[model samples]
Target chain A: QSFLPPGWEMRIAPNGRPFFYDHNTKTTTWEDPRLKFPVH
Target chain B: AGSPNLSPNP
Candidate 1:
């Protein structure tokens, strides 16, 4: 199971960082939706 | 404050 919302998935980029992908929306983002704000 | 450059692009 994933913490992400339905239709969303997480994949590691070439940089070895996790990025969010929305299949329903056809979009991508670096920030996790679960976090209020992204950190370094 | 000056900090290391961390671009948002992945």
Candidate 2:
């Protein structure tokens, strides 16, 4: 099988969310809100 | 002809 490319890491939101970095579009986005979490 | 802009690292 062909190799699937990886994603990117973007700036965290005010809610402490992890935004993935899209290499294809070369931009950051908060598509996955579930990644956000609170620090203990 | 593949995803050139994407990263290769895991």
Candidate 3:
């Protein structure tokens, strides 16, 4: 998914989708590389 | 599923 696309390793969710971890932001936002910048 | 590597900062 987006997480994998962004170079961030990910794990499959219980529903079988990739998840991401933002170490710098200290967040676990949905990793959508196509996600618009200035993410709000 | 959260991990220690998962940021807890906020």
Q: Which one is best on DockQ?
A: 3
Best of the candidates, TM-score:
1
In order, what DockQ does each candidate have? 0.04, 0.05, 0.19
Clashing pairs in 2: A8-A21
Candidate achieving higher TM-score, 1 or 3 = 1
Model 3 error, position A28 (Å):
0.7
Error of 2 at A12 (Å): 4.5
Evaluate all candidate structures by whole-model CA lDDT and list the values in order: 0.52, 0.42, 0.46
Pairs clashing in candidate 1? none
Q: In candidate 3, how many clashes are counted? A: 0
- lDDT per residue, candidate 2, B1-10, as tens digits? 3322333233
Candidate 3 clashes between residue pairs 3 or more apart in a chain or in different chains: none
| DockQ-based class of model 2 | incorrect
Write down the lDDT that model 1 would get. Answer: 0.52
Per-residue lDDT tens digits of candidate 3, residues A1-40? 3323333445555564554644455446554644533443
The digit string of per-residue lDDT tens for model 3 on B1-10 reads 3442443233
Residue lDDT tens for model 1, A1-40 = 2587654566665667565665555556666655522321
